């Protein structure tokens, strides 16, 4: 039973209705940046005693913070911006939330209804702009539609395949006095009719049947299993099938486990890719067969009977044609199959020890490796130390590039919603703001931003946000003085021809530029720099032990390469296993 | 006669064709940020010995730099980004360039043609996204269309009413070998047929006729007169008509002149607004009657016979219905009218001395003013000192807010393309990157970024760009520790109720946060802070005299208000002339 | 005070709400064709005792009948169709109503809301299809929105510049029981803010001023003056300015008048075109400067000071740049100028007798002419007889082609809304159904369809409608056994090379095919055929005197050409005055 700050018969501003509509959705935290078209909303936010506002220093930082908030909780992330320049600063975050299927609700202010289409001051058709990069969007044309639209927005953003939903609110609507109706039905008849219903026992036992008929099966786990950690692990026990996870699905099945093949794909482990290459049954649960995982589709799982389970019917038979398909929640599909496997453990032989040992050979023959040059810090080693000193219980957010891959390879995530990274869009400057949102959603948790110097500087302004909001955000900055991932492709495919990849100062080459420590000092954040591998262990320990925000500038040799690697649109027999830029 | 780096019969990469297509457009400088979808382009850029690339630390900084490059030269600004996150980081700059009619060409990398529509890695329908915020955009579907599209892009961006044009280039097109045809005709039959032709002598002498029949005329000059400085001044001599300029039209007519009414509008001078209010003839040249200038249209120039000249036919009769209209280049319209006025000076009485003295009374009665509290630095005074110490010859770029208005009020711009500011979209974080582009376009010029602490921090990362590129960018930072313009509306309309407008640290209120000096130090840029008005003159002098980049952190009392002010959608009799937040 | 068939607190079907919504708009007649998706609506129509339904035999006939109903009354025309094939059969009528600015409301049935987008049975995104060919359209997503949308539909269709408005209604919405709210406000804030307000006395007396300063003025009257017959005639008396009318503006000023220059344009009279060519003041009232009137714009009224009055701001300065422009209702503009001319008749000389006599010379030198070959009936002569025997008081609807032009040239329409013809779209098969709708709107009026054999046969099925509905529709069929207008262009520009223009039977060339008399007999309509000019007078008399429907098959020599003629994109000095296909 909800308690309002207004009488049921009392006229309220549209902005007040909007905020209460958020309160009724259980919203505790928003990321809002003020402007003329959304001042009424911010005024109403102050009148709320339940909704906290974290003020970013950039709306892109605001929406990315809403993502990190969402990714590390399961709750929808809410960001608010003003019209024009404020709204257009959300675009990258919206597209990012769409490709990674992150539940997010964005509210943008807008010019009065009378001025829409006249190219007015700070006017942008943000609905027209964001239609192709959001799950759905709205343009409120009446104050009475506010309670309904907000309900529809949160419903669409969280249910089915999660995604970003934008609600554009005119300024005059915010000012208009009205009495809200909270019991009006949602106008989504088509969407709800197409919502997948619980899986039939028909489909489920056919899959279980295929499991016993195949003796070389591989689990293909992705971001669709982020809410099925228990059911998935229970499924693995009953089957004994090795697990290959994606960039988006890390943590679903414990990376330190003996049945774990870790990440598969372009920069996935060799033994994971080998498993899929020589599998006869592929259990694709909560994935979307991205080109970064498959390469050339015709060779990907060529001899494998493919089973695909997804809550989105559009993803089924999209890139790779499956044998058996189940459209629905994989959480329920697991529960259904789990009850069958235990009640039918006798009839089913179920022993893939021979196949497991075949993979375990590859797991020892071609394992993840890195070189240690003198006293120079291996970035792979630094992340491994962070794992040990945090016991793999730290929430990790990253930017995009070489550091992103190493953070996914050399950290054993034990539970989902611990790994926050841009995979679909792969947007830089995601790391720091995402850490901000995750720290707010999880106050008592260890939050570490494993960032690259290129990505870190893009939204470096959010360091001020961290200090002001007093968030214990740790920044493990892997500094290679380059746009590493771009540099790596240059060494591999372009004769190491440097095309604007060096981030330092061409007047003083061996001086670290910029001085990231002074960035932290500018925002009153304690920081330190480590260059030698010996001091690395103590340095990271200091970062963790020191209360509040901390920046550790870890200097790494730039010639390092992310291995292994499969060139875009290739096969498993094209895997690069050795080499760098030395 | 152009000299290529390739033989006329030699097959070249599409990326090489693209770069040469830019070379044939006279492009000397681009602002490109590398990524997987645009690596071929960056490789081809290095092979060019005429095109220089300035590497930003953020694509938003890249496109804003392209704007400042364009705004301070008249040449089109070129920015290049990769697919996905790179392209979406250009959005704000594109929308900004559209609303301020700035000639700009944006080139974005894209996934191969075979992968368009599959929600691939780093894929965003940027054409679909930017259609409503660009003049025009393209999606290259063949390597043979590159020379034509690029020619059409630069033509559309610079001709008629200037604007942003985006060209999306697939990765496979960049790699495809081909022989370019540079003599293919442009496919713009409709656009060129609708292009305004030189004004008839019929329309022009009717305007001249109205000039003599009215004895209280006012010139309404805007951003359409940026290329008519000579013709406009010549026109004023022949007529003696007082000149009211817009935010976008500053510098067209010298602000220090005795016939100058300076800026009109919401934050325009009282005597400028009074002139338009009590005019009988309004000469609207190169304007678009924005709501920030007119307020309520019915009261704006209510008793004035309105003459409107614009190169865009869609702007004629859009918001305010004109009496006489001339669709075409105002530069030619002035030249046509100028030759008439001098050859017909005898018949025409032409003496508005009585009307001029009527306005000159208002010019002394209600002039621009500011208070000086103790030793606290008035932001209005600081800008006035900068004017004196630069002799009004310094290129000024600003952010958005209170500092933006004061920089437009208390600096006398003598020539156009000296005032760089976001007016239509009004996007923060514009100041610093725009100064970067302007410094590249004008190396020997004094470039000063009059920025606010809120706007400055948004794209603060571009400080690294300034140092690396060794640009003599001066940063006059007016620090009020607040989002001032938002704070001002709070003091005026919301009982001074602070709704997330304070930018400092709520743990140490009277400490300046963040320490902007350390931001500059992080990027090896010399910086200083001044608090007392006495030290202000020497401090600004030091900033100017010190070679290379410099940051001056000017501390200002936050209670200051931009005056005068007309509330949104008001009349001239609603002007606020006194008051602040004390 | 409206009287409902339902209690204010009684739940009603959505279809019943829809019909009552029409009743509250004063709708007396609809043109509906039944289908599965609109059965509920047709059931509700029978429950109404005020709304009459005319059942067409084709939905294209239905919408064209709604046009004729609208064009000959000023009231909006209402047509109803089912989903899929029914809706797509309205398309031509919708596009036709848009280009001729005809007030029309189309209601289409639709699949249930749950099935929209699944390519269901008889599903077509008719909103998506008709968006570019309607003024506005709706998709009802809730039964509660029915009273509002219908009100907005009729308001948009009739106010401002009239046009077609489509309302798509899902089947489940029609079945859903609800209690309608008739006092809900319309959601058109932007549209109403942009609605032109009454013309200022400022603009009006400037026009009156130009009238006295020019001694060779010409009135350019179009379809915008259809509701200003009295005001226009009063204006002519006060000025004495000759009147040139368009295809859409016939009847506004009496064609038989001595000040009438009749039609101008491609097939307009020579003296009308001469007037505009050598005018110094062009009073363009209620026109849109179509290419069929101007040809090459640069030569059209080259030496004339152009005054343009239109209720659509988008039409001002569209093709031809005007000197003086007044955005608003021309009816009010005339009233405003009329009161000035009479109160200021003394000061104004106002005597264009010299210019009038100059035109009157051309009016006698190059008049409308036709040849009479033996006893063969001249189509021009037949129409002239119809004029005499109906005293120019008969409502005339036509098809498209040679007969359409002759019906506009050789019939003197005394009042507006007497001339019904497709001008903008120029759609064949318009004649017969439009006559149907006009006969229903005007029962006691003489309605004659001057049709061509090609156009007549396209919607010949509506002959059944005429008989069933017992409408006194007269059909003056001008039979040339060819697609004449297409044939004429062949004789003029393609060496008389027949490219599928003959409509008869290539097995019996001099036999009239098809036998149109048997078409009439099939629908129980009395008909006759006349071939010799002598019998023509009595034959037409019989058609008029015979009660009820009648078809007169008038046989004409096909070699006749519409004269004069200006080739597409030409000038006045390119007028073809003599010649045919003999
Ligand atoms: C530099 C870089 C390199 C990369 N290289 C790799 C790589 O080597 N390997 C790799 O794996 N990724 C890599 N990626 C990331 C890659 O681009 C994609 O992000 C990733 O492959 C997609 O992971 P996913 O399909 O498993 O999860 P998602 O993209 O999140 O897809 C989730 C799918 O599961 C479905 N789903 C969601 N919820 C449910 C539910 N409750 N029940 C059932 N189904 C559900 C959804 O409909 C959707 O189809 C890289 C990214 C970057 C930036
Ligand atoms: C915080 C803030 C406050 C503001 N307050 C004010 C204010 O008080 N006063 C004010 O004036 N502005 C103010 N603005 C800016 C305002 O929003 C608009 O940017 C500005 O009013 C538009 O100026 P403009 O129409 O003259 O020039 P533009 O917006 O650049 O329009 C140019 C017009 O001239 C035409 N044109 C272009 N080239 C030619 C040519 N060669 N020949 C003929 N025609 C041409 C174009 O078609 C166009 O119609 C403010 C902005 C901000 C951010
Ligand atoms: C075979 C053929 C040949 C043709 N040849 C000719 C020809 O020779 N000569 C000719 O004239 N036409 C000819 N046409 C027709 C031509 O294509 C156009 O239909 C016609 O020229 C347009 O007439 P109009 O602009 O005057 O009226 P409309 O097309 O109906 O335009 C009405 C205009 O007046 C405005 N308006 C409407 N209501 C009001 C109001 N209350 N107050 C103020 N303004 C208002 C509207 O906004 C609009 O701009 C021909 C058509 C066909 C099929
Ligand atoms: C420059 C760059 C990358 C280099 C990032 O530099 P970093 O310094 O942050 O990372 P790293 O050296 O450890 O690899 S990665 C990349 C990919 C994978 O497309 N892009 C393109 C890119 C460009 N701009 C944004 C916002 N996001 C992006 N991913
Ligand atoms: C926060 C803010 C403003 C305050 C800017 O803070 P500043 O510190 O930079 O400027 P100031 O104190 O001197 O006034 S101005 C404004 C307007 C006029 O809409 N917005 C909204 C806004 C929000 N985000 C962006 C990118 N651009 C914007 N203009
Ligand atoms: C065939 C034809 C025409 C010939 C019509 O044949 P008619 O027999 O009806 O008319 P006519 O001989 O007296 O000239 S006119 C025309 C124009 C002006 O575009 N079209 C093209 C046309 C084709 N189809 C439709 C529905 N409408 C059209 N106007
Ligand atoms: Mg790096
Ligand atoms: Mg500030
Ligand atoms: Mg015919």
Distance CA(A514)–CA(A521), nearest Å, equals 13
Q: Is A32 helix (H, G, I), strand (E, B) or coil?
A: strand
Task: Pick the catalytic residue from A13, A23, A110, A171.
Answer: A171
- A-chain CB neighbours of C187 within 8 Å are 141-142
Nearest to A284, CA basis, from A256, A239, A245, A253: A245
Distance CA(C363)–CA(B491), nearest Å, equals 73
Nearest to C531, CA basis, from C486, C477, C581: C477
Asked if the Cβ–Cβ distance from B115 to A318 is below 8 Å, we say no
Helix/strand/coil (H, E, C) string of B273-337?
A: HHHHHCCCEEEEECCCCCHHHHCCCCCCCCCCEEEEEECCCCCCCCCCCCCEEEECCHHHHHHHH
**Residues whose CB falls within 8 Å of the CB of residue C551, separated by 6 or more in sequence, listed in order:** C463, C475, C477, C516, C517, C519, C520, C525, C526, C527, C528, C543
Distance CA(A323)–CA(A306), nearest Å, equals 5
Yes or no: say if C269 and C263 are a contact pair by the CB < 8 Å rule. Answer: yes
Q: Is C553 helix (H, G, I), strand (E, B) or coil?
A: strand
Helix/strand/coil (H, E, C) string of A62-88?
A: HHHHHHHHHHCCCCCEEEEECCCHHHH
Q: Ligand 3 in contact with C288 (CB < 6 A)?
A: yes
CATH of C196-368+563-582, one of 1.20.1250.20, 3.40.50.1220, 3.40.50.720, 3.40.50.970: 3.40.50.1220
For the CA of A425, the nearest atom of ligand 1: 53
Tokens in use for B232? 């406009």
Which parts of B389-483 are beta strand (E)? 395-398, 419-420, 447-452, 473-479
Tokens in use for C270? 């020579």
**What ligand is nearest to the CA atom of residue B431?**
5
Beta bridge partners of C398: C450
**Which chain B residue shows the shortest CA-CA distance from A99?**
B119
**Residues whose CB falls within 8 Å of the CB of residue C559, separated by 6 or more in sequence, listed in order:** C580, C581, C582
Distance CA(B68)–CA(B439), nearest Å, equals 9
**Which chain A residue shows the shortest CA-CA distance from C189?**
A114
Distance of CA B171 to the CA centre of its chain: 33
Distance CA(A59)–CA(A61), nearest Å, equals 5
Distance CA(B254)–CA(A485), nearest Å, equals 51
Task: Pick the catalytic residue from A263, A485, A487, A516.
Answer: A485
Nearest to C106, CA basis, from C92, C125, C124, C87: C87
Beta bridge partners of B263: B245
Question: In this structure, what DSSP letter does residue C184 have?
Answer: P
Asked if the Cβ–Cβ distance from C325 to B327 is below 8 Å, we say no
Q: Ligand 2 in contact with B267 (CB < 6 A)?
A: yes
Q: Is A10 helix (H, G, I), strand (E, B) or coil?
A: coil
Asked if the Cβ–Cβ distance from B206 to C318 is below 8 Å, we say no
Indicate which residue's Cα is closest to atom 12 of ligand 6: C484
Residue-by-residue DSSP string for C280-335: SEEEEES----HHHHSSTTTTTTT-EEEEEES-TTSTTSSS--SEEEES-HHHHHH
Yes or no: say if C466 and C475 are a contact pair by the CB < 8 Å rule. Answer: no
**Residues whose CB falls within 8 Å of the CB of residue B28, separated by 6 or more in sequence, listed in order:** B50, B51, B52
For the CA of B426, the nearest atom of ligand 5: 29
List where CATH 3.40.50.970 sits in chain B: 1-195, 369-562
Distance CA(B28)–CA(A46), nearest Å, equals 51
Distance CA(C64)–CA(C421), nearest Å, equals 10
* Residues of B classed as catalytic: 59, 121-122, 171, 485
Beta bridge partners of A319: none
Tokens in use for A8? 């049921």
Nearest to C342, CA basis, from C214, C218, C208: C208
Nearest to A440, CA basis, from A467, A419, A471, A463: A471
Torsion of the alpha carbons at C427, C433, C434 and C439, rounded to the nearest 10: 170
Burial degree of A185 (CB within 10 A; 0-12, 13-18, 19+): exposed
Tokens in use for C352? 């264009």
Q: Ligand 2 in contact with B318 (CB < 6 A)?
A: no
Cis bond before residue C539 (omega within 30° of 0): no
Tell me whether residue C533 is annotated as binding: no
CA-based nearest distance A190→chain C, Å: 4
Indicate which residue's Cα is closest to atom 1 of ligand 1: A401
CATH of A369-562, one of 3.90.1300.10, 3.10.310.30, 3.40.50.300, 3.40.50.970: 3.40.50.970
Distance CA(B498)–CA(A23), nearest Å, equals 21
Catalytic residue at A485?
Answer: yes
Distance CA(A409)–CA(C387), nearest Å, equals 92
Yes or no: say if C241 and C283 are a contact pair by the CB < 8 Å rule. Answer: yes
Burial degree of C420 (CB within 10 A; 0-12, 13-18, 19+): buried
CA-based nearest distance C207→chain B, Å: 10
Residue B63: CB atoms within 10 Å: 30
List where CATH 3.40.50.1220 sits in chain C: 196-368+563-582
* Method in brief: X-ray
Yes or no: say if A238 and A342 are a contact pair by the CB < 8 Å rule. Answer: yes
Distance CA(C472)–CA(C464), nearest Å, equals 13
Nearest to B180, CA basis, from B141, B142, B154: B142
Burial degree of C555 (CB within 10 A; 0-12, 13-18, 19+): buried
* CA distance readout (Å), A185 to B409, C110, C354: 53, 22, 74
Distance CA(C152)–CA(C167), nearest Å, equals 10
> What phi and psi values does residue C435 have, to the nearest 5 degrees?
-65, -35
Residue A31 Cα to ligand 8 middle (Å): 20
Question: In this structure, what DSSP letter does residue B125 have?
Answer: -
Distance CA(B312)–CA(C168), nearest Å, equals 37
Yes or no: say if A483 and B479 are a contact pair by the CB < 8 Å rule. Answer: no
Distance CA(A68)–CA(A465), nearest Å, equals 15
Asked if the Cβ–Cβ distance from A190 to C113 is below 8 Å, we say yes
Distance CA(B491)–CA(B485), nearest Å, equals 10
CA-based nearest distance C48→chain B, Å: 45
Closest to C324 (Cβ–Cβ): which among B202, B316, B324?
A: B324
Token match 């019915």: residue? Answer: B298
Residue-by-residue DSSP string for A224-273: GGTT-HHHHHHHHHHH---EEE-SSSTTSS-TTSTTEEEE-STTS-HHHH
> What phi and psi values does residue C529 have, to the nearest 5 degrees?
-130, 130
Token match 């409608």: residue? Answer: C465
Burial degree of B294 (CB within 10 A; 0-12, 13-18, 19+): buried
Nearest to C38, CA basis, from C23, C53, C50: C53
Nearest to A230, CA basis, from A335, A328, A75: A335
Distance CA(A51)–CA(A26), nearest Å, equals 9
Yes or no: say if C202 and B302 are a contact pair by the CB < 8 Å rule. Answer: no
Torsion over CA: B4, B7, B9, B11 (sign)? negative
Continuous H helices in A278-391: 291-294, 330-343, 353-365, 379-390
CATH number of A1-195: 3.40.50.970
Resolution in A: 3.0
Nearest to C478, CA basis, from C393, C567, C411, C547: C411
Strands B12-13 and B177-178: antiparallel
Nearest to A158, CA basis, from A51, A78, A56, A52: A78
Yes or no: say if C432 and C462 are a contact pair by the CB < 8 Å rule. Answer: yes
Yes or no: say if C400 and C391 are a contact pair by the CB < 8 Å rule. Answer: no
> What phi and psi values does residue A98 have, to the nearest 5 degrees?
-75, -45
Distance CA(B27)–CA(B50), nearest Å, equals 8
Question: In this structure, what DSSP letter does residue B133 have?
Answer: G
Q: What is the Cβ-side half-sphere exposure of residue A130, based on CA atoms within 13 angstroms?
A: 34
- Rounded-to-5 percentages of helix, strand, coil across chain B: 40, 15, 45
**Residues whose CB falls within 8 Å of the CB of residue C391, separated by 6 or more in sequence, listed in order:** none
Distance CA(A571)–CA(A577), nearest Å, equals 14
Catalytic residue at A298?
Answer: no
Cis bond before residue C564 (omega within 30° of 0): yes
> What phi and psi values does residue B494 have, to the nearest 5 degrees?
-130, 30
Asked if the Cβ–Cβ distance from B325 to C321 is below 8 Å, we say yes
Distance CA(B567)–CA(C191), nearest Å, equals 24
């Amino acid at each position: 039973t909800f308690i309002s700050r207004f009488a049921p018969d009392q006229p309220r501003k549209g902005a007040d209705i909007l905020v209460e509509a958020l309160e009724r959705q259980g919203v505790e935290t928003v990321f809002a940046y003020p402007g003329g078209a959304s001042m009424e909303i911010h005024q109403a936010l102050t009148r709320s005693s339940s909704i906290r506002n974290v003020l970013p220093r950039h709306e892109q930082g605001g929406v990315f913070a809403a993502e990190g908030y969402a990714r590390s909780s399961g709750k929808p992330g809410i960001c608010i911006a003003t019209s024009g320049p404020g709204a257009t600063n959300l675009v990258s975050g919206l597209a990012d939330a769409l490709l990674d299927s992150v539940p997010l609700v964005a509210i943008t202010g807008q010019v009065p209804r009378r001025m829409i289409g006249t190219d007015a001051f700070q006017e942008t058709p943000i609905v027209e702009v964001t239609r192709s990069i959001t799950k759905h969007n709205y343009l409120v044309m009446d104050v009475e539609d506010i309670p309904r639209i907000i309900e529809e927005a949160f419903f669409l953003a969280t249910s089915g395949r999660p995604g970003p939903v934008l609600v554009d609110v005119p300024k005059d609507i915010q000012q208009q006095l009205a009495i809200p109706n909270w019991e009006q039905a949602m106008r989504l008849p088509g969407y709800m009719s197409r919502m997948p219903k619980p899986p039939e026992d028909s489909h489920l036992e056919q899959i279980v049947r295929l499991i016993s008929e195949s003796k070389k099966p591989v689990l293909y786990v992705g971001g669709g299993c982020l809410n099925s950690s228990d059911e998935l692990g229970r499924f693995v026990e009953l089957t004994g099938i090795p697990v290959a996870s994606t960039l988006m699905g890390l943590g679903s099945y414990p990376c330190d486990d003996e049945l774990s093949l870790h990440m598969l794909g372009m920069h996935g482990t060799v033994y994971a890719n080998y498993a899929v290459e020589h599998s006869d049954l592929l259990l694709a649960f909560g994935v979307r067969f991205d080109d970064r995982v498959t390469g050339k589709l015709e060779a990907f799982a060529s001899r494998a009977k493919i089973v695909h389970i997804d809550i989105d019917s559009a993803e089924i038979g999209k890139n790779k044609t499956p044998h058996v398909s189940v459209c629905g929640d994989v959480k329920l599909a697991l529960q259904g199959m789990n009850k069958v496997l235990e009640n039918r453990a006798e009839e089913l032989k179920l022993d893939f020890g021979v196949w497991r040992n075949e993979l375990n050979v590859q797991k020892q023959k071609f394992p993840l490796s890195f070189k240690t040059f003198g006293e120079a810090i291996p970035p792979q080693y630094a992340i491994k130390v962070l794992d040990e000193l945090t016991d793999g219980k730290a929430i990790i957010s990253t930017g995009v590039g070489q550091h992103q891959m190493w953070a996914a390879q050399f950290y054993n995530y034990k539970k989902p919603r611990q790994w926050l990274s841009s995979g679909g869009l792969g947007a830089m400057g995601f790391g720091l703001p995402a850490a901000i949102g995750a720290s707010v959603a999880n106050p008592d948790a260890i939050v570490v931003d494993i960032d690259g110097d290129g990505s870190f500087i893009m939204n470096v302004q959010e360091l001020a946000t961290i200090r002001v909001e007093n968030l214990p955000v740790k920044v493990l900055l892997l500094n290679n003085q380059h746009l590493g991932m771009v540099m790596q492709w240059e060494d591999r495919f372009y004769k190491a021809n440097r095309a604007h990849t060096f981030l330092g100062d061409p007047a003083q080459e061996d001086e670290i530029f910029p001085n990231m420590l002074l960035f932290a000092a500018a925002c009153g954040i304690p920081a330190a720099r480590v260059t030698k591998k010996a001091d690395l262990r103590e340095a990271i320990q200091t970062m963790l032990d020191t209360p509040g925000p901390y920046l550790l500038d870890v200097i790494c040799p730039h010639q390092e390469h992310v291995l292994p690697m499969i060139p875009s649109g290739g096969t498993f027999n094209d895997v690069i296993t050795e080499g760098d830029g030395r």
